[PDB]
């Protein structure tokens, strides 16, 4: 029998509830963390929030023309009229996405705004058979759809080096020497439960919205294909994770093209 | 009469805020940037450490006296409709600590009003004697959250060197700060002074509890009828300065500055 152990792990902080079910064992809904819907900090992170440092567009339309400055910063605006990535979007090597911000002349409903509108897909936390907790979609998700953001505690590399648990870190790539990461161990959203898959249906993309401090991109997961209702979400953890954890366990994603077992 | 803007906020508020001018030929104001939340130019080291937040451990709707956030606010002053209780001291308002993301309660608990944003149907309009003003297009019951005074967070040192001081809101306290809505602000930058105000500003804390930076929320002091202009008491610092230049045009029989 499938036990509903939570009607909403986000307790109303998302646009829709995220229930938790367990049809496997007697484990209750996870509670060793604090759910937050947006990134937080403990030690200060001096994000550049000077409004005059934002690059912005002066579009007089819905930011669907070639002249949009924010589209140019993203090479081009990759969103279609429904907010989904165009098929030309390179998911093997995603570019930086600069969404429109509060300094732009455009309206809040312009085309170049997707991730800033929050989680919309109906997801469900559930107990897997051999990978702990996982996240599944309760609905069909078309390809190129924004699913969720990897939310957690913004910490420096120096802080990440003294944390005992490293299984919930997401490294923030930046050309500058200073490096940071998102730790979802103590504070995080639904994305902290997404398991690794070697042929993933999700791809992380670095996105900038209210600020453009390149040290702190926000991590948005987009669907790489049609995700059918009931299917578990997964993304590629990368080589750093498996270089560390491979000596502890092999990958259990079950793909015929598994690269870590 | 003459609609000069369908929405001065460009969709950043829950409701459009149109602008009309039935008085003269002035177009919609455009010498500023509309922002729906406070911004900064020079950095402000607001304490955003999540472990520094006081929070409640309520298992209900935060309607009991055990709610930590209510105790910080002396008590929770919101009724089930989100309006201030009749016991609220409009003459000397307390600090309001709304529930935050560190609390164990849900996003729809009783102690959350200002963080839900502007809801009332407002309208920017041209007055006959004091430039632009804001009016309500609907009846607003007493104790209702109307709007927040939004703008650029600046220090006292910065405020003392700004040529235009007509859009400052002082955040009183050693180090003191203020909100300058001259270059960046929301609809509240157009609210005029009235000696019989129907709005009262209240200092509110939500996502952070850095007492240097309270957010300014306007609540109705009485039933505001549809079509009535919004107004609050600018205070004596404003009128000690600007009284040398002009007199108050609020038109009240109890006007104190004309
Ligand atoms: C100098 O001071 C400011 C500098 C900037 C401002 C505003 C400023 O205030 C001026 C105050 C003057 N007072 C006017 C009345 C009395 C005094 N505008 C912003 C944003 C504009 C859009 C809305 C959000 C703010 C961007 N950054 C800024 N300079 C860049 C703008 C774009 N150029 C070009 C290369 C394209 C690069 C430098
Ligand atoms: C095990 O998987 C990772 C492990 C580490 C990572 C990243 C990892 O997976 C990222 C992808 C998987 N995610 C899973 C959920 C979401 C994606 N990050 C780094 C740097 C962090 C800061 C930014 C630059 C890279 C540090 N080293 C790590 N663990 C060490 C921490 C300190 N301990 C002891 C010294 C106490 C030794 C191991
Ligand atoms: C009114 O009394 C309750 C009202 C609600 C409760 C519990 C309640 O009991 C309190 C008394 C209990 N007795 C006291 C003695 C013994 C038990 N529960 C919550 C949560 C439900 C999910 C699990 C955590 C608590 C949400 N719904 C509630 N109404 C809200 C709906 C939204 N409004 C706003 C729009 C203003 C805020 C009130
Ligand atoms: C004119 O009305 C005010 C004038 C001033 C205020 C506040 C005021 O109105 C507040 C209420 C009215 N609002 C209107 C919209 C919303 C409420 N605040 C202060 C301090 C700011 C923060 C630290 C403590 C107080 C600075 N001095 C002030 N003007 C000077 C600035 C520097 N210039 C230079 C030329 C030298 C000389 C005049
Ligand atoms: N493909 C995979 N194969 C084996 N274990 C995996 C896996 N993907 C994720 N995991 C497990 O999940 C951790 C990532 S955190 C992901 C959520 C986790 N399943 C939970 O219940 O909290 C990894 O450290 C590993 O222990
Ligand atoms: N009660 C009042 N009497 C006369 N002028 C007033 C007033 N209340 C506000 N004002 C004018 O408005 C300024 C405050 S900013 C308020 C908006 C302003 N009416 C505008 O059109 O931009 C004051 O400096 C004063 O010039
Ligand atoms: Zn644009
Ligand atoms: Zn833009
Ligand atoms: Zn735009
Ligand atoms: Zn695998
Ligand atoms: Zn509470
Ligand atoms: Zn609460
Ligand atoms: Zn609380
Ligand atoms: Zn008056």
Swiss-Prot record, chain A:
Positions of S-adenosyl-L-methionine binding: 131-133, 168, 195-196, 252
Tissue-specificity statement: Widely expressed.
Domain named SET: residues: 121-238
Residues carrying Phosphoserine: 43
Disulfide pattern: none
Chain residues that bind Zn(2+) 3: 63, 100, 106, 110
Protein residues bound to Zn(2+) 2: 57, 70, 100, 104
Localization: Nucleus; Chromosome
Binding annotation for Zn(2+) 4: 198, 251, 253, 258
Interaction with histone H3: annotated segments: 157-176, 237-240
Top-level taxon in the UniProt lineage: Eukaryota
Binding annotation for Zn(2+) 1: 57, 59, 63, 68
Site (Histone H3K9me binding): 150
UniProt family annotation: Belongs to the class V-like SAM-binding methyltransferase superfamily.
Domain notes: The ANK repeats recognize and bind RELA subunit of NF-kappa-B, when RELA is monomethylated at 'Lys-310'. They also specifically recognize and bind H3K9me1 and H3K9me2.
Function of the protein: Histone methyltransferase that specifically mono- and dimethylates 'Lys-9' of histone H3 (H3K9me1 and H3K9me2, respectively) in euchromatin. H3K9me represents a specific tag for epigenetic transcriptional repression by recruiting HP1 proteins to methylated histones. Also weakly methylates 'Lys-27' of histone H3 (H3K27me). Also required for DNA methylation, the histone methyltransferase activity is not required for DNA methylation, suggesting that these 2 activities function independently. Probably targeted to histone H3 by different DNA-binding proteins like E2F6, MGA, MAX and/or DP1.
Associated disorder: Kleefstra syndrome 1: A form of Kleefstra syndrome, an autosomal dominant disease characterized by variable intellectual disability, psychomotor developmental delay, seizures, behavioral abnormalities, and facial dysmorphisms. KLEFS1 patients additionally manifest brachy(micro)cephaly, congenital heart defects, and urogenital defects.
Quaternary state and interactors: Heterodimer; heterodimerizes with EHMT2. Interacts with WIZ and EHMT2. Part of the E2F6.com-1 complex in G0 phase composed of E2F6, MGA, MAX, TFDP1, CBX3, BAT8, EHMT1, RING1, RNF2, MBLR, L3MBTL2 and YAF2. Interacts (via ANK repeats) with RELA (when monomethylated at 'Lys-310'). Interacts with MPHOSPH8. Interacts with CDYL. Interacts with REST only in the presence of CDYL. Part of a complex containing at least CDYL, REST, WIZ, SETB1, EHMT1 and EHMT2. Interacts with BAZ2B.
The protein's name: Histone-lysine N-methyltransferase EHMT1
